[PDB]
Symmetry: C3
Subunit: 355 residues, 3 copies
């Protein structure tokens, strides 16, 4: 129960003050006490979790507890807590929730940035709290689709202390050895859902430099840069593990394989050479259907128009991903078995693969 709890934290704050050493050393010890308690106790975001009727009962005890700590100490504590300490002593939970609410989406009544920090007035007539640090945004990968033509991924900023439009975002590919880097511009965003089209024709020339490419979201605020590793929060990955995309580069074949890391479950891209006939079989089904089968893993191809090229003939077709390791190319006419063996080239809607 609230005031039985904050009763206790009040007395602990009292004894830190009546310990036996200097004045300013007690507040530093005390300042660390409420950085942690507001970060890791019941107090964090109580105005959004507790239902609205019981929260009046919460702010009284918090108020008497926060009344016990001197106003001096609000300068050494983490900057984003100064408003909550102030409305705690004032037992003002319309504004206390507003603040905790204001941090989640970055919607303040009035605000602006100064020196890369926030100055916020949370409601009309209330003071401005100045110099509030900007914490790292939480990112959830809410979509991830890919084929042999592009990768489409959606990253959703679930929590960020600053609203849409005042920051820039890019998708960052960082090699595991940190030596090489790729940046993909934003394609479109709907509120805080950020969608990136990674065209493999754009990144084919740079991928061979390293095998492991880790995915980050870069978020820039003027010149303060956040590097957010992405993947550990996500919607359910839509493919069987090791599902890959076929890449063709300087007469050689490669696979691009998304996967999730062992230590922290983040998403990365594995790029390595293959031998096409060891990885994918090509067979004739009926007289007008070509079937591509991933032998060890699924390969996803873009659906739509396709063609097969012989040395003196060509046939159009329609490609469809019938299963996660099986692709059907429905040809526009019959192909004899003897000529099927002489396919020189296979094309999807945007890519060509010389056999």
């Amino acid at each position: 129960s609230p005031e039985d709890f904050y009763e206790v934290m009040r007395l602990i704050a009292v004894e830190i003050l009546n310990a036996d050493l200097e004045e300013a050393h007690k507040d530093q010890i005390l300042a660390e006490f409420l950085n942690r308690h507001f970060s890791f106790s019941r107090t964090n975001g109580f105005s959004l979790k507790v239902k609205l009727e019981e929260q009046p009962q919460w702010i009284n005890a918090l108020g008497d507890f926060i009344q016990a700590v001197p106003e001096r100490v609000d300068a050494l504590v983490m900057s984003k807590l100064r408003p909550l300490l102030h409305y705690a002593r004032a037992k003002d939970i319309d504004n206390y929730r507003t603040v905790e609410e204001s941090y989640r989406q970055g919607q303040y009544y009035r605000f602006d940035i100064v020196d890369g920090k926030l100055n916020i007035q949370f409601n009309e007539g209330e003071p401005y709290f100045e110099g509030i640090d900007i914490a790292k945004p939480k990112v959830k990968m809410t979509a991830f689709k890919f084929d042999n033509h592009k990768i489409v991924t959606e990253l959703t900023l679930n929590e960020f202390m600053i609203g849409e439009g005042h920051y820039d975002v890019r998708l960052k590919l960082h090699s595991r050895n940190k030596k090489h880097t790729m940046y993909v511009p934003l394609s479109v965003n709907a509120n805080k859902q950020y969608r990136f089209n990674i065209m493999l024709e754009d990144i084919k020339a740079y991928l061979p430099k390293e095998k492991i490419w880790d995915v980050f979201l870069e978020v820039q605020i003027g010149t303060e840069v956040f590097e957010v590793r992405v993947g550990n929060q996500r919607n359910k990955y839509a493919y069987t593990a090791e599902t890959s995309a076929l890449i063709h580069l300087n007469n050689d074949f490669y696979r691009l394989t998304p996967y999730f890391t062992k230590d922290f479950n983040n998403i990365s891209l594995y790029f390595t050479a293959i031998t096409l006939t060891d990885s994918i079989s090509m067979k004739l089904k009926g007289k007008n259907k070509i079937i591509l089968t991933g032998l060890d893993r699924g390969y996803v191809f873009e659906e739509g128009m396709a063609s097969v090229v012989l040395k003196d003939d060509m046939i159009m077709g329609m490609l469809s991903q019938t299963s996660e390791n099986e692709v059907e190319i429905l040809l526009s006419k019959d192909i004899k078995k003897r000529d099927f063996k002489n396919i020189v080239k296979l094309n999807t809607a945007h890519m060509t693969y010389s056999l």
Copy 2:
């Protein structure tokens, strides 16, 4: 005639000063007097409208009139008028026009921004006028084309007090209830003509959230943001009203319909469900042509390669928009009437529609 006119405005300025109340209250009343007169009288942009020979005759009378108002008052008047008041008293119309000229395109001899405001020196050797506010840009929609694959729109900033390169622009879709938002990056710009390619594959996932999407141009200068509603100034809209684009989304069909609002003639996008066979007929013409007819409104499709898919066969074709509600798909071979009834799938160059 000029000095008969500015004669009068001089005497009106004289009587505001000889009214009977405090000193600073007269200038505020006076400051509002010339905010309006420069905004809504013959004086606005006279150096660009009047032909060059008669303007010398204008600046003398303006000079004697502006000579009557104290230099004190140039601090409470709208910031962008301070240069014109100064060159008025100086009866300097080479610089007066230069200023009015300088505001139209944002081409100053010397300038830079400070606190989101302009500090301008209009000619060599002349003073710097500091702290000039930036008014909202005028936008004209100079192109708007669309099909079932993308929207291409060109927005031209006809007037803006700051030159190309120092601001950013994005295309904003804002739901009528302000709840949801889409931002499209700039695709290319030629001087102050800004072209946006809105790929429907990029926005298909976000459109179903609301029916009405209003079009804005966002213009950002550091952190000062302008929201400009667009459409009321435009070149002639190139389609018959209610012309739409067909969208396919999770087995369901929709229309995306550009239109212009009743109250202020701005352009918006209407997204709503349809029943394909109630809206579009598909018929065979001759033996090798498929005709799509919009029954209630025209539907625009991307011209170029297309195909029709049957359950065990496929046929390529060429799509052409023969009229605004009629589309022809010229097939590569004949199709029997009995098989035309068994078309399972229809594809344009970039989109697929399962029947």
Copy 3:
């Protein structure tokens, strides 16, 4: 040899001081002396050119020479030399090289920008040198490919005093008369390799305004803009001179021709009208191959799916660039010679050309 050389420069610095005129006029004459010597002598970048063992022998003599010039003068010399003058007197070549190293890629131990200038601490514990100007980046065009559908060019910043991520870049097309302009956004970048996809459908409407379009790279740092003319440093151009791309615009045909200027060997784009049948021949080879031959210059087309349209029939094909002025369209079926003469329309994968 080092100290025989810097011996001399020391004495020259001595006599500039013992000349007969004012104090501050000698330092200005002296300040210009070491702007040039560090810019155009053995001293420039010696810590990166000389091999590591012999450089200790270099910094002693430089030290005694730089010891002779007063510390007063480091304020009037070019800002980026202040660290090297300081570590010269200190004969500190671990830090001297670090600085020269730090300028090449823009990798400082600690730094930030202030007023569009750098404040740098080069190693842990060392002072901060403040107010360092940012010189123009060196640009090398490391790739340039094009066809009738897009231009793909890669620009590599070989040297830039500021690391990736803190600046923006755009590709600029500037008409020779400076009247018209085109800006192409960045498509992707890998470290300091910046790739631009210039879609001709995006720039077709703006190209007719002028014939000569010069290529620049714009680099923006807050509001300080660099205009870097590109082309004179490049990898070997991949096409024969005058190789062009065919453009179709309002029933008329044009060529877009990259070329390099006479005076400074920079790359530009020439846009001018042609008569299709005077520039490109179309002939039948065998019964299923259409050959496009550039008569006066090569024309590059995008490889992949293509089609030819007759007034009541259409044929798909595969386009391949067999030589730099010869293109083969391998049709899906035979075409009679009498119907080949009645081709109304020719399509590549993304473009259409009405004959």
